[PDB]
Design a protein around this ligand. Structure first.
Ligand code: CA
Ligand code: CA
Ligand code: CA
Ligand code: CA
Ligand code: CA
Ligand code: CA
Ligand code: CA
Ligand code: CA
Lengths: 255, 255, 255, 255
């Protein structure tokens, strides 16, 4: 708690502290840069970024070459991250799972699939696994440690819920134990509790028509400010717009 | 009328009367079950349904193999019906016409295309025809029982508004008589007045991106709670979610 | 200013002045009419239009054969214009750029790409170019009239932002001068300031699923009443609906 | 702020919350374990750890095989980390640079050596680079972007400040721009701001005589509690002591 008195003073600007003290990291796909075909595009855009008010050493340009790799290896480097995603219609869920991770605040612990069969607790306990090739088979346990539609002994009776993905947020019926069978060789599966959203990313979507259903349930559909959309023409245009509206995009994030 | 006094008592639960006294019917497409590949999937899910609070003999599993057949033969068996529809982009309107029927409350009478040329009255009088192959040709009549752009005598001058569909909700300019030419051999066309919505279905949509325009007009777009959407991964996952959020889905329907 | 006193007397109707004094212009694509296959469809619909209250000589039918040509040559002829656009997924942005032009109120001046390098001023200053084949390459100037990632001398170093389009609304980082290189032979590029919206069109969209992002930025998404959507079945049905709901559609425009 | 009233109540124990809720991670070098020569040393010590009050699944044993690799790949896994370092006199600075990283709280951003010549701001802005082989050459710029004792064009005139290290905290004259030339192939260099110390590690030093100068300047010498020293005899003895005084060591860290 804060005291609630309406002094009523708004302290001027806000954008003049962020220009001085914060970093902006732009994530794009390879195809984006390839279409631009210049050895100095990162540089040209940077001078253009001074216009919008970001000092030379301020803006960074990170190249993901696919939504699957980016979804994994996506350690967000800067204060503000605005990631460019161009609609690929077959990869939609890949994209959804990646958005769900960046746009939100995640808390995870490690899981030992080998020794302890687990269970999710609430609408916020999910299993986020990611890596080379993630293949997850599951087997629900009744209150005896016995299978239900499966033999905890032969994984050929398990239920496959992911076949070789690069990022996967698995959801099982809450309050039920499950013997898990991941391909830990190429995958890593961790038990995460959700929450806090992200006051950074700003997934900007290129193409389609969208409406984005990023919930695991069917009941809710959340539309946040850190979820923007741009009409595709050419990649140079996309970047010009991102620059011409940096502050607007940053203002939709913060901290 | 009810008395409006704010006694202000909410009577506890609500979900503990529906668990005891109601039935839940899950409609899915063949492909859904085929991908699951287990002889006991209906059973496993049922035990999982006890968790969410539905007694053994409570939940039923109905298999439509196509949106066209389901759209016809779709006599809703249970108290609560939640129908799973997975995006098929060419069938969209087939899907729209089917949604329009389940999600809403319909009143129909039979039409004799042979002896009496009809007319729709308001934004709620529509002609819902369905069957093997529904092919409807129409001919608008001026106030003399004469064609307008057609000869009430030769159907080769009629205007075709449906070419072999499995479910069709036809709409004509309100307040105008029309000689109708349906292929009654394989089709049945009935005159329906709309209305009451449905406090049951809950069309859950798999895939795409959606926004759904289920009005006949251009002016309105209604988005109801009984119109949910899930992000596709695998079918086992879809069902796990439907189970993990049965009550949430049921609560969005009722009665 | 008007006086604000609540006399409170709504003057009756509104639709009975428009029926008498206004004109309605329907724009459709060739494919639309071709599917109808009648030499008297324009006529039949016209008699049907008397029902909804539009005197014989009132309604006009204009045929665009493509979104690209219509986007150019689209001088709106009548008081009320309702344009029918059927989803074509590869042409989306072509469609977006065309919508942005009809649905809005535009102010333009001519640009001489040859003698004066320009700059856009605010989120409302855009460069709308259109013609046979519009190909625009740009070169940002620093405060010296020198290129930034380009040589104002060789257009092989310019940045291409449009490759042969029929309608293009170009957006560059605000407050920066640019030497422009359009193919003026087949294109015309003009400097427009936006604004006033249109109290006429009513782009009615056939097919897809839509949500339409018609802003240049990423932050905003505006959804107006003059942006309607219809579920595709057959073209005859589309027109019947447009007629059966003319007033509803007109009421969503006006003046 | 907290209220400062001297209620004067100390709440008992402190160690009985840490025993229940926290994890202890012991880092040692390979040589340490090799000298122990038992397949069950990790296990024996664990039972011994119950004595000091740490439940079975509580303590973890991580093996760094060198100060250089550990310095890189040293993602601290547990709540409390106590790292064992045995004096190697040629690697002193390697050790100093590693201590400086664990014992302290670090904030970093990524640097693009290719496109932007940087500068450090205060006694707390340092360049921490680490990897396979880190070789950093520097070239100070006067206020013109011109070299000072170097040609920003030929790196053969640069000043080498690190020749193939595994962890390097580089320090340059504050407030001066520098064109940097790292061997990014095998190295990664990031711009870090220092600060917060670490309320965890507890570098325990084996051998020598020490006094440790972990500042970049010459003026200060900080000696913290999270910087302990043990007299070498045998490795088994070292671990016995670490166990016999776990709480004492933990108490010198916390949170
Ligand atoms: Ca199975
Ligand atoms: Ca769950
Ligand atoms: Ca005809
Ligand atoms: Ca009607
Ligand atoms: Ca260029
Ligand atoms: Ca602009
Ligand atoms: Ca030198
Ligand atoms: Ca310094």
């Amino acid at each position: 708690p804060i005291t609630g008195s309406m002094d009523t003073a708004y302290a001027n600007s806000t954008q003049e502290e962020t220009f001085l003290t914060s970093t902006l990291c732009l994530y794009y796909p390879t195809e984006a840069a390839t279409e631009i075909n210049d050895n100095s595009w990162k540089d040209t855009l940077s001078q253009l970024f001074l216009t919008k008010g970001w000092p030379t050493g301020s803006v960074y340009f990170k190249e993901y070459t696919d939504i699957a790799s980016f979804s994994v290896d996506p350690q967000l480097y800067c204060d503000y991250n605005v990631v460019l995603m161009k609609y690929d219609a077959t990869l939609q869920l890949d994209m959804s799972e990646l958005a769900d991770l960046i746009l939100n605040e995640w808390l995870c612990n490690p899981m030992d699939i080998t020794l302890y069969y687990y269970q999710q607790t609430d609408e916020a306990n999910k299993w986020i696994s990611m890596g080379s090739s993630c293949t997850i088979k599951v087997c629900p346990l009744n209150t005896q440690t016995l299978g239900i539609g499966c033999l905890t002994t032969d994984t050929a009776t398990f239920e496959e819920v992911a076949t070789a993905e690069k990022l996967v947020i698995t959801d099982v019926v809450d309050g039920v134990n499950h013997k898990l069978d991941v391909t830990t060789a190429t995958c890593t599966i961790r038990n995460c509790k959700k929450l806090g959203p992200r006051e950074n990313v700003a997934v900007i979507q290129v193409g389609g028509s969208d409406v984005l259903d990023i919930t695991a349930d069917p009941t809710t559909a959340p539309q946040t400010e850190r979820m923007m959309r741009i009409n595709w023409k050419k990649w140079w245009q996309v970047f010009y717009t991102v620059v011409d509206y940096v502050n607007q995009i940053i203002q939709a994030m913060s901290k």
